[PDB]
Design an enzyme around this catalytic site. Structure first.
Site, PDB file in Angstrom:
ATOM      1  N   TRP A 285     -12.362  51.629 -63.708  1.00  0.00           N
ATOM      2  CA  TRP A 285     -11.508  50.979 -62.841  1.00  0.00           C
ATOM      3  C   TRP A 285     -10.805  52.095 -61.701  1.00  0.00           C
ATOM      4  O   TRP A 285     -10.577  52.290 -60.896  1.00  0.00           O
ATOM      5  CB  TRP A 285     -10.585  50.167 -62.245  1.00  0.00           C
ATOM      6  CG  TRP A 285     -11.231  48.721 -63.298  1.00  0.00           C
ATOM      7  CD1 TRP A 285     -10.743  48.263 -64.741  1.00  0.00           C
ATOM      8  CD2 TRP A 285     -12.649  47.977 -62.431  1.00  0.00           C
ATOM      9  NE1 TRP A 285     -11.931  46.834 -65.161  1.00  0.00           N
ATOM     10  CE2 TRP A 285     -12.830  47.018 -64.117  1.00  0.00           C
ATOM     11  CE3 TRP A 285     -13.248  47.995 -61.670  1.00  0.00           C
ATOM     12  CZ2 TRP A 285     -13.806  46.144 -63.458  1.00  0.00           C
ATOM     13  CZ3 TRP A 285     -14.329  47.169 -61.505  1.00  0.00           C
ATOM     14  CH2 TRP A 285     -14.833  46.366 -62.738  1.00  0.00           C
TER      15      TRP A 285
ATOM     16  N   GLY B  94      -6.197  44.873 -56.150  1.00  0.00           N
ATOM     17  CA  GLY B  94      -5.166  44.477 -55.382  1.00  0.00           C
ATOM     18  C   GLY B  94      -4.634  44.541 -54.579  1.00  0.00           C
ATOM     19  O   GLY B  94      -3.476  44.553 -54.527  1.00  0.00           O
TER      20      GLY B  94
ATOM     21  N   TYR C  16     -20.272  50.550 -59.085  1.00  0.00           N
ATOM     22  CA  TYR C  16     -20.751  50.012 -57.535  1.00  0.00           C
ATOM     23  C   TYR C  16     -21.558  50.847 -57.013  1.00  0.00           C
ATOM     24  O   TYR C  16     -22.290  50.868 -55.380  1.00  0.00           O
ATOM     25  CB  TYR C  16     -19.486  50.188 -56.286  1.00  0.00           C
ATOM     26  CG  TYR C  16     -18.055  49.481 -56.776  1.00  0.00           C
ATOM     27  CD1 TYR C  16     -18.346  48.244 -57.598  1.00  0.00           C
ATOM     28  CD2 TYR C  16     -16.655  49.948 -56.524  1.00  0.00           C
ATOM     29  CE1 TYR C  16     -17.238  47.566 -57.791  1.00  0.00           C
ATOM     30  CE2 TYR C  16     -15.746  49.491 -56.738  1.00  0.00           C
ATOM     31  CZ  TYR C  16     -15.776  47.901 -57.277  1.00  0.00           C
ATOM     32  OH  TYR C  16     -14.515  47.532 -57.919  1.00  0.00           O
TER      33      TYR C  16
ATOM     34  N   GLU D 273     -14.998  41.090 -53.967  1.00  0.00           N
ATOM     35  CA  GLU D 273     -14.906  40.841 -55.313  1.00  0.00           C
ATOM     36  C   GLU D 273     -13.844  41.164 -55.086  1.00  0.00           C
ATOM     37  O   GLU D 273     -12.963  42.362 -54.881  1.00  0.00           O
ATOM     38  CB  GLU D 273     -15.316  41.497 -56.567  1.00  0.00           C
ATOM     39  CG  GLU D 273     -15.371  40.987 -58.004  1.00  0.00           C
ATOM     40  CD  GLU D 273     -14.147  41.497 -58.292  1.00  0.00           C
ATOM     41  OE1 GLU D 273     -13.667  40.629 -59.208  1.00  0.00           O
ATOM     42  OE2 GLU D 273     -13.769  42.437 -58.178  1.00  0.00           O
ATOM     43  N   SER D 274     -12.677  40.619 -55.674  1.00  0.00           N
ATOM     44  CA  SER D 274     -10.949  40.612 -56.129  1.00  0.00           C
ATOM     45  C   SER D 274     -10.555  39.958 -54.966  1.00  0.00           C
ATOM     46  O   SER D 274     -11.447  39.677 -53.433  1.00  0.00           O
ATOM     47  CB  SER D 274     -11.186  40.717 -57.583  1.00  0.00           C
ATOM     48  OG  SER D 274     -10.059  41.043 -57.769  1.00  0.00           O
TER      49      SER D 274
ATOM     50  N   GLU E 238     -10.686  33.765 -65.903  1.00  0.00           N
ATOM     51  CA  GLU E 238     -10.587  34.721 -64.548  1.00  0.00           C
ATOM     52  C   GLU E 238      -9.223  35.229 -64.838  1.00  0.00           C
ATOM     53  O   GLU E 238      -9.358  36.155 -64.336  1.00  0.00           O
ATOM     54  CB  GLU E 238     -10.521  33.367 -63.164  1.00  0.00           C
ATOM     55  CG  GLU E 238     -11.679  33.774 -62.798  1.00  0.00           C
ATOM     56  CD  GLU E 238     -12.277  34.770 -61.362  1.00  0.00           C
ATOM     57  OE1 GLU E 238     -11.218  35.613 -61.693  1.00  0.00           O
ATOM     58  OE2 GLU E 238     -13.050  34.690 -61.790  1.00  0.00           O
TER      59      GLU E 238
ATOM     60  N   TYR F  29      -7.374  38.781 -68.746  1.00  0.00           N
ATOM     61  CA  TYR F  29      -7.180  40.221 -67.699  1.00  0.00           C
ATOM     62  C   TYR F  29      -6.034  40.562 -67.215  1.00  0.00           C
ATOM     63  O   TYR F  29      -5.683  41.826 -67.921  1.00  0.00           O
ATOM     64  CB  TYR F  29      -8.047  40.768 -66.567  1.00  0.00           C
ATOM     65  CG  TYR F  29      -8.478  41.924 -66.279  1.00  0.00           C
ATOM     66  CD1 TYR F  29      -8.714  43.154 -67.078  1.00  0.00           C
ATOM     67  CD2 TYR F  29      -7.050  42.381 -65.687  1.00  0.00           C
ATOM     68  CE1 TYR F  29      -8.246  44.407 -66.152  1.00  0.00           C
ATOM     69  CE2 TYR F  29      -7.056  43.210 -64.457  1.00  0.00           C
ATOM     70  CZ  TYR F  29      -8.051  44.478 -65.731  1.00  0.00           C
ATOM     71  OH  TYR F  29      -7.107  45.814 -65.014  1.00  0.00           O
TER      72      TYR F  29
ATOM     73  N   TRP G 260     -13.152  45.024 -73.563  1.00  0.00           N
ATOM     74  CA  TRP G 260     -12.242  43.868 -74.536  1.00  0.00           C
ATOM     75  C   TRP G 260     -12.592  43.055 -75.237  1.00  0.00           C
ATOM     76  O   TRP G 260     -12.888  42.622 -75.726  1.00  0.00           O
ATOM     77  CB  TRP G 260     -11.913  43.736 -73.071  1.00  0.00           C
ATOM     78  CG  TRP G 260     -11.718  43.830 -71.178  1.00  0.00           C
ATOM     79  CD1 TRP G 260     -11.952  44.562 -70.492  1.00  0.00           C
ATOM     80  CD2 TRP G 260     -10.078  44.222 -71.292  1.00  0.00           C
ATOM     81  NE1 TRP G 260     -11.683  45.131 -69.621  1.00  0.00           N
ATOM     82  CE2 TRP G 260     -10.454  45.298 -70.133  1.00  0.00           C
ATOM     83  CE3 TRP G 260      -8.579  44.202 -72.302  1.00  0.00           C
ATOM     84  CZ2 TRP G 260      -9.324  45.777 -69.980  1.00  0.00           C
ATOM     85  CZ3 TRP G 260      -7.807  45.303 -71.396  1.00  0.00           C
ATOM     86  CH2 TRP G 260      -8.079  45.548 -70.327  1.00  0.00           C
TER      87      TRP G 260
ATOM     88  N   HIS H  80     -12.128  38.964 -65.705  1.00  0.00           N
ATOM     89  CA  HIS H  80     -11.917  38.980 -64.218  1.00  0.00           C
ATOM     90  C   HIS H  80     -12.907  39.967 -64.280  1.00  0.00           C
ATOM     91  O   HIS H  80     -12.489  41.308 -64.552  1.00  0.00           O
ATOM     92  CB  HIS H  80     -10.767  39.134 -63.204  1.00  0.00           C
ATOM     93  CG  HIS H  80     -10.949  39.249 -61.984  1.00  0.00           C
ATOM     94  ND1 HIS H  80     -10.982  38.485 -61.374  1.00  0.00           N
ATOM     95  CD2 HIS H  80     -10.472  40.056 -61.589  1.00  0.00           C
ATOM     96  CE1 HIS H  80     -10.847  38.504 -59.904  1.00  0.00           C
ATOM     97  NE2 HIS H  80     -10.673  39.527 -60.027  1.00  0.00           N
TER      98      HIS H  80
HETATM   99  N1  HI6 Z   1       2.901  52.047 -57.630  1.00  0.00           N
HETATM  100  C1  HI6 Z   1       2.882  51.301 -58.793  1.00  0.00           C
HETATM  101  O1  HI6 Z   1       4.052  52.041 -59.630  1.00  0.00           O
HETATM  102  C2  HI6 Z   1       2.010  50.366 -59.182  1.00  0.00           C
HETATM  103  C3  HI6 Z   1       2.201  49.575 -60.399  1.00  0.00           C
HETATM  104  C4  HI6 Z   1       1.767  48.607 -60.869  1.00  0.00           C
HETATM  105  N2  HI6 Z   1       0.134  48.811 -60.349  1.00  0.00           N
HETATM  106  C5  HI6 Z   1      -0.489  47.687 -61.137  1.00  0.00           C
HETATM  107  O2  HI6 Z   1       0.059  47.091 -62.238  1.00  0.00           O
HETATM  108  C6  HI6 Z   1      -1.081  47.124 -62.984  1.00  0.00           C
HETATM  109  N3  HI6 Z   1      -1.424  45.747 -63.202  1.00  0.00           N
HETATM  110  C7  HI6 Z   1      -3.028  45.992 -63.312  1.00  0.00           C
HETATM  111  C8  HI6 Z   1      -3.678  45.505 -63.262  1.00  0.00           C
HETATM  112  C9  HI6 Z   1      -3.495  43.385 -62.717  1.00  0.00           C
HETATM  113  C10 HI6 Z   1      -2.217  43.729 -62.351  1.00  0.00           C
HETATM  114  C11 HI6 Z   1      -1.386  44.524 -62.662  1.00  0.00           C
HETATM  115  C12 HI6 Z   1      -0.338  44.560 -62.182  1.00  0.00           C
HETATM  116  N4  HI6 Z   1       0.466  43.127 -62.047  1.00  0.00           N
HETATM  117  O3  HI6 Z   1       2.044  43.175 -62.135  1.00  0.00           O
HETATM  118  C13 HI6 Z   1       0.408  49.292 -59.570  1.00  0.00           C
HETATM  119  C14 HI6 Z   1       1.067  49.816 -58.851  1.00  0.00           C
HETATM  120  P1  L1M Z   2      -8.251  42.257 -58.223  1.00  0.00           P
HETATM  121  O1  L1M Z   2      -8.512  43.094 -56.647  1.00  0.00           O
HETATM  122  N1  L1M Z   2      -9.148  43.342 -59.089  1.00  0.00           N
HETATM  123  C1  L1M Z   2      -8.692  43.535 -59.901  1.00  0.00           C
HETATM  124  C2  L1M Z   2      -8.136  43.606 -61.007  1.00  0.00           C
HETATM  125  N2  L1M Z   2     -10.740  44.375 -60.328  1.00  0.00           N
HETATM  126  C3  L1M Z   2     -11.814  45.134 -59.929  1.00  0.00           C
HETATM  127  C4  L1M Z   2     -11.249  46.148 -59.692  1.00  0.00           C
HETATM  128  C5  L1M Z   2     -10.510  45.231 -61.714  1.00  0.00           C
HETATM  129  C6  L1M Z   2     -10.545  44.516 -63.036  1.00  0.00           C
HETATM  130  O2  L1M Z   2      -7.135  41.219 -58.597  1.00  0.00           O
HETATM  131  C7  L1M Z   2      -5.713  40.732 -58.626  1.00  0.00           C
HETATM  132  C8  L1M Z   2      -6.164  40.157 -56.824  1.00  0.00           C
END
Ligand code: HI6
Ligand code: L1M
Ligand SMILES: *[C@@H]1O[C@H](CO[C@@H]2O[C@@H](C)[C@@H](O)[C@@H](O)[C@@H]2O)[C@@H](O[C@@H]2O[C@H](CO)[C@@H](O)[C@H](O)[C@H]2NC(C)=O)[C@H](O)[C@H]1NC(C)=O
Ligand SMILES: *[C@@H]1O[C@H](CO[C@@H]2O[C@@H](C)[C@@H](O)[C@@H](O)[C@@H]2O)[C@@H](O[C@@H]2O[C@H](CO)[C@@H](O)[C@H](O)[C@H]2NC(C)=O)[C@H](O)[C@H]1NC(C)=O
Ligand SMILES: *[C@@H]1O[C@H](CO[C@@H]2O[C@@H](C)[C@@H](O)[C@@H](O)[C@@H]2O)[C@@H](O[C@@H]2O[C@H](CO)[C@@H](O)[C@H](O)[C@H]2NC(C)=O)[C@H](O)[C@H]1NC(C)=O
Ligand code: HI6
Ligand code: NAG
Ligand code: NAG
Ligand code: L1M
Lengths: 530, 532
Positions: free
Chosen positions: B83, B119, B130, B199-200, B328, B331, B433, B441
């Site tokens: 990813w 996200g 992709y 997706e997502s 879902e 992950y 995993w 997910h």
């Molecule tokens: N700009 C950042 O520091 C930063 C830190 C972490 N993330 C993403 O964090 C890891 N992560 C990875 C996959 C799914 C969720 C999450 C976090 N959830 O709180 C994005 C930006």
């Molecule tokens: P989703 O946008 N997608 C995720 C976490 N992903 C696909 C690029 C990694 C498996 O995140 C939650 C909204």
């Protein structure tokens, strides 16, 4: 005359009757006065001990039923007439009954004291279903049952008053328990092995004597059948009790002084207060009653839930249980779309309408948490599923979960608890098949009514009744229903073990509807506070 | 020169490449500019259309990945690195890709437009998973994918401001969709038959285009995989967006609030990596499944909230394909939930489960958390670690993905749309995993794009037939609005029957209810607890 039927209690002399049983005779002393008649100026007042009498008091037949409403929903129907008064109504009604073996025991004998149910508005010790002759003969115990004042006569409370202090119907029960301690030895009963047991509101009264120190020293074991003192229907606050007592006065023309209010109430004929006692309920409801025990700091120093959570119950053994379909019976008394004369396959609208009746006086958010938990969202409008769901709503909220909370707390705080579910539908049951095993229809098997030759119970049901009488008497003698065969394990907060009671051998199962009762006992209290 | 690799769009002339697939040749046009680079003074602003050019633009490779955070929790681990960006990071990144059969189609061909997830803070159309070459070769489609700005560069919003209006990453997608309407016929695609699928967060983006009228006229069918615009993570309010933007500026030293123009202009002088390094410090609480800068409900792109638009919407003439994976939420638990890790079985305690619930369901009242504990606790085994692990996985999955997707599918079917639903239940043989995560997910994507057909990877022969089954499913929906051929049939999802199909190596199996009992609690009861 007969020496076995002549007993002298501390008040005077009594003459009893010899009764017939399919296994030999038993002696019965019926209609023993244990209190001064609470009439006239004694209405609403705590009971006074019976004054000594000269001569022989005739203890040969049941005395009058305390004034109460008579159910008229299905006139002549056996399923409801069996609970209706079978004796004349009167406020001169504080009498008790003693059943003993024939001849009377030489050695002290364990004593069972029965408190009847009836929503604190009805009931009588003289009902055919409470006949103690079979239990006494089969298990060689002493059986005592008492009448206590019900309805407004027993539980009308103007809190803080002295002309209407409330809970005097409970004080009637206590006085009879004091009578047993002072006089049961004259019948061969052992006052050091007294086991309280009651059903429905009688089970709630049994629980309330457990949580009241003055009554706690008058018995040693307790059995609660399909009832609990922590039920949402069993107690009422001081503010609501005063509101209900004041509106009953208005509904009958009285009168402002508590002294004047009760004075004018005491002038009304007893039948007048009966006719208006139900119109003081705050909303249309199933499973709610006007005049119930009041939490006033006296008989109950706190709510039954508080006293249960704070109590030390070591050295106490208790036997608790429910029937399989606790809610079925109450639905034909107001739940829209319900009747005993068809299958009462209700609609989604009637289901939601019935939820507000079975769970009254709660917020809309609270009502729909119920709808969420009791809806199958793959079949949200199935009429058969909705009928059973609403019965689960009424049964879990009012009986099964209050009992499950009491069993869990007592077990975790010293008590040894035995739990059962009664799952046998009697062959003689007149109620429709969709009701299952309705509320209160384990009593006839506990009292051994199937052994009456007059009735059409089957041979297996007769053996089943003897099993149940042995379980109950074993517990009364030792605090353990088992006999030293499948064994009945104690109920604990962790394992949550209970037994099935039917024509099959004992089956051990886990969880008194743990999922449904987590909603009622743990989550929803937090929802109402915030 | 090869005439089939030369296309003229409205902006100028392009030169593509002839891609080799197991099934034959595909023509790929990778790195077509559709907007002016959003750099310097253009940072945080709506995209401007790319001005015309003279000469030939070599659209022969994937362009830069839009600036973003690069995950580092399991360095070198395949399950996480797939990813991560596979090109250099840049703010010059608004490019789209087009795959088309070789030779170009003779007649108009249906078009599948892809929106990646991540996200709203990460992702790229250049990711190996992709790769649109297999879908086009196997199903004779035109596939388009575009890059869009993510993180603060795409979704920092000072609502009302003209210099940082927010939702510009969404407008990047819309601009690409306008590019498809004007230029896809030059590649043999049918602009009258455009199926959006993502997706997502990309699935949430697809939904927001359905609820925004200026976007709705640019496509005709939609596919939402494990995401929905009404999810508790997909949008934010104008007030919380302003707070998150202000505090990010404060963390990097601007101003040295106040004037919006002065604030953004100071932000535009900060290096891109500095903004990325502080993006996650603005989140109100420690949580999984919450992201700092996502679409905003400002009354412009979204007139109201997606839940309101879904409920008050008329969807007659619309065909939608929705679905989720089997597990879902698993992950997300390895990214904060106490006691979780991919490197052990993550058998958590009661206290870890209770602590993990407030991380998975952030900023809800204590009463709300208790309701979640009540519904997901088995009160006969309330402390079983394995049951507790699965229950927390279901908590995060239902609250964030399944329940929101199920609400959308039901409201659309009831309001005139033809809906089809699925649950992807195959765990790939090559999944890195741990097993306790089940089907995690985002791991249905590789089968939708036909990646198992890639000769360099070791999928089994059954998994290659499975990918060919799903590619035909998706393409049949894109062509006709119905995944069926005309073989076991896939029935439409309706609010009553709630029918969906399982997608595994076995044939189709119809089931009822997308976790109806659980989702009723998320979609019906809990909203009104939060109200009162
Ligand atoms: N700009 C950042 O520091 C930063 C830190 C972490 N993330 C993403 O964090 C890891 N992560 C990875 C996959 C799914 C969720 C999450 C976090 N959830 O709180 C994005 C930006
Ligand atoms: P989703 O946008 N997608 C995720 C976490 N992903 C696909 C690029 C990694 C498996 O995140 C939650 C909204
Ligand atoms: C099943 O009966 C109930 C109860 O209705 C009563 O009992 C019936 C046997 C018959 O004698 C009726 O005439 C009685 O009224 C029906 O429940 C409805 O109950 C509401 C209030 O409780 C009443 O207002 C309605 O009129 C009743 N519905 C009727 C009379 O059709 C219930 O509908 C019956 N179930 C069926 C017909 O499937
Ligand atoms: C918020 O600021 C803008 C821009 O301020 C300009 O640049 C600053 C660095 C400042 O030092 C001044 O040089 C400028 O005003 C304001 O909009 C400006 O308005 C003036 C005249 O009204 C105009 O000359 C500028 O071109 C405008 N700049 C724009 C539109 O970007 C704006 O008025 C300020 N808001 C408030 C409430 O004062
Ligand atoms: C399962 O793993 C988690 C995560 O811990 C990390 O991953 C492990 C595979 C191992 O490499 C640990 O050293 C890593 O820290 C464990 O939860 C952690 O437990 C450690 C102490 O054992 C503690 O210091 C951390 O704070 C914990 N982290 C979190 C997020 O809770 C968990 O205990 C492991 N399960 C076991 C050991 O049974
Ligand atoms: N005094 C009265 O009017 C009166 C009326 C009704 N009840 C009891 O109600 C009948 N009933 C009897 C048994 C079970 C339920 C019900 C009613 N449910 O709403 C007592 C007193
Ligand atoms: C037993 O059955 C007979 C059948 O004729 C009936 O008359 C009698 O009343 C029944 N006894 C009961 C119901 O107690
Ligand atoms: C497939 O398996 C072979 C066998 O070792 C290996 O050489 C190759 O790298 C694998 N392909 C991958 C991991 O993509
Ligand atoms: C708590 C209300 O129920 P309980 O008083 N008992 C009842 C209603 N019956 C009638 C079947 C048994 C005596």
């Amino acid at each position: 005359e007969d020496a076995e039927l002549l007993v002298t209690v501390r008040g005077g002399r009594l003459r009893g009757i010899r009764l017939k049983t399919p296994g030999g005779p038993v002696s019965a002393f019926l209609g023993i006065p244990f209190a001064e008649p609470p009439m006239g100026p004694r209405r609403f007042l705590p009971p006074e001990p019976k004054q000594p009498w000269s001569g022989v008091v005739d203890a040969t037949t049941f005395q009058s039923v305390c004034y109460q409403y008579v159910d008229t929903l299905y006139p002549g129907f056996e399923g409801t007439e069996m609970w209706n008064p079978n004796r004349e109504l009167s406020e001169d009604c504080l009498y008790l009954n003693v059943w003993t073996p024939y001849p009377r025991p030489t050695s002290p004998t364990p004593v069972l004291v029965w408190i009847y149910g009836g929503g604190f508005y009805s009931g009588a010790s003289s009902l055919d279903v409470y006949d103690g002759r079979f239990l006494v003969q089969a298990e060689r115990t002493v059986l005592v049952s008492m009448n206590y004042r019900v309805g407004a006569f027993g539980f009308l409370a103007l809190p803080g008053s002295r002309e209407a202090p409330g809970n005097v119907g409970l004080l009637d029960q206590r006085l009879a328990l004091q009578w047993v301690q002072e006089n049961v030895a004259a019948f061969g009963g052992d006052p050091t092995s007294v086991t309280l047991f009651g059903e429905s509101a009688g089970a709630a009264s049994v629980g309330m004597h457990l949580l009241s120190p003055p009554s706690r020293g008058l018995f040693h074991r307790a059995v609660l059948q399909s009832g609990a003192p922590n039920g949402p229907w069993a107690t009422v606050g001081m503010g609501e009790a005063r509101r209900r007592a004041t509106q009953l006065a208005h509904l009958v023309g009285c009168p402002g002084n508590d002294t004047e209010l009760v004075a004018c109430l005491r002038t009304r004929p007893a039948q007048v207060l009966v006719n208006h006692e139900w119109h003081v309920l705050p909303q249309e409801s199933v499973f709610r009653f006007s005049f119930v025990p009041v939490v006033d700091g006296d008989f109950l120093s706190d709510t039954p839930e508080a006293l249960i959570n704070a109590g030390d119950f070591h050295g106490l053994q208790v036997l608790v249980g429910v029937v399989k379909d606790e809610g079925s019976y109450f639905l034909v008394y107001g739940a829209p779309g319900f009747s005993k004369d068809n299958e009462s396959l209700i609609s989604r609208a009637e289901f939601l309408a019935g939820v507000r009746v079975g769970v009254p006086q709660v917020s809309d958010l609270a009502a729909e948490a119920v709808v969420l938990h009791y809806t199958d969202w793959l079949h949200p409008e199935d009429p058969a599923r909705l009928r059973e769901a609403l019965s689960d709503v009424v049964g879990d909220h009012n009986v099964v979960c209050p009992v499950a909370q009491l069993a869990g707390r007592l077990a975790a705080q010293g008590a040894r608890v035995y739990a059962y579910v009664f799952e046998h539908r009697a062959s003689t049951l007149s109620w429709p098949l969709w009701m299952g095993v309705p509320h209160g229809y384990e009593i006839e098997f506990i009292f051994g009514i199937p052994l009456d030759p007059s009735r059409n119970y089957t041979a297996e049901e007769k053996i089943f009744a003897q099993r149940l009488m042995r379980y109950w008497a074993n517990f009364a003698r030792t605090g353990d229903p088992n006999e030293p065969a499948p064994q009945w394990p104690p109920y604990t907060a962790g394992a949550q073990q209970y037994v099935s009671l039917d024509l099959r051998p004992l089956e051990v199962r886990r969880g008194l509807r743990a999922q449904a009762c987590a909603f009622w006992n743990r989550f929803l209290p937090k929802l109402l506070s915030a």
